[PDB]
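During the second half of the funding period, the structural biology subgroup turned its attention to how the target accommodates small molecules. The most pressing case was calcium ion, which had performed well in the primary screen but for which no bound structure existed. We therefore specified the complex as follows and requested a full 3D prediction, including the ligand pose.
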Amino acid sequence: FWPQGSTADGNITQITAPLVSGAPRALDISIPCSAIATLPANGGLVLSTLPAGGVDTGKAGLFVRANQDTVVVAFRDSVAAVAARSTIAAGGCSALHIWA
Amino acid sequence: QYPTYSNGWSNVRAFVGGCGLADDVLVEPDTNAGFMKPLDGDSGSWGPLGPLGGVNPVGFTPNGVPEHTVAEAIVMKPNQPGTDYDWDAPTKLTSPGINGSTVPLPYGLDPARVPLAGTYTTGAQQQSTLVSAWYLLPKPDDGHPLVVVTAAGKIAGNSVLHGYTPGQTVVLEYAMPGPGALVPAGRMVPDDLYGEQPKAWRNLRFARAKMPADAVAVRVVAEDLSLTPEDWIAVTPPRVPDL
Ligand SMILES: [Ca+2]
């Protein structure tokens, strides 16, 4: 489960768990929109299952990138849930729900 | 596969004067003729990409091709024997084009008369799209049997020796005469030969005999929904060769 840490002032921490078989069996994720409405301008990496610095981590993992004007929920380089960023930070949505 | 070339038909056709394959192969000299003109009489919505871009060409850019992209080949490190000059030519042009591109075009296409549109960037990929303008279509004939679009990138189309070779989308939809709106009426999947070589300037071809007799216009449609840095697309306007 996650968040399982805290680093001494709220601030849930990342974790590392390199799975041997690659993909998991189930991936119920959830993110509130009061948490996506707090990124700065140009946003960046709301959540991920791989670090964005590795070798070809785009076509392997899951990336929720909040760029300017949009929040794109990709997959193995296959967009699933583009959503505008002016209705997220307005009370238009409730929670981003991912499942695999 | 008849009345076209076959061994048994050629052997007996060589009695009354036959040249083998030199009769069934058509060649296009001066591949700068046959370019159609946009039906849309609007110099408005067409932005910095021209009539090839159309309305909201988001994702596409004139300089959207990698560096050593050549016609029907892939450049490698050491000097290979029997290669074209476009393996060694300068990587850019010392002038812009009609769009504003500095990409060397293949087959002898004049970069001062032929625009371009590509979806190759470094960093911050996205989902592209392009819907060209309505290109008028001449009256049919027997000597002009196909429509051609010179394109590079990862494209999905049929061929012999390979089933489907999936990829991105170029479909050249067409229209039929009506009250004056020219709504689309169909789509066509290209016939490319260099499907397993995704960077080759491969000259896609659409047979004219498949679309209906009274077709007024056509237009290009390209998607590129893949965010991989090596899944890109590039296109030029359609033309009717002379053959
Ligand atoms: Ca792409």
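Two results from this model are relevant to the next phase. The two ends of chain A are 16 Å apart (CA to CA). The longest strand of chain A covers residues 29-32.
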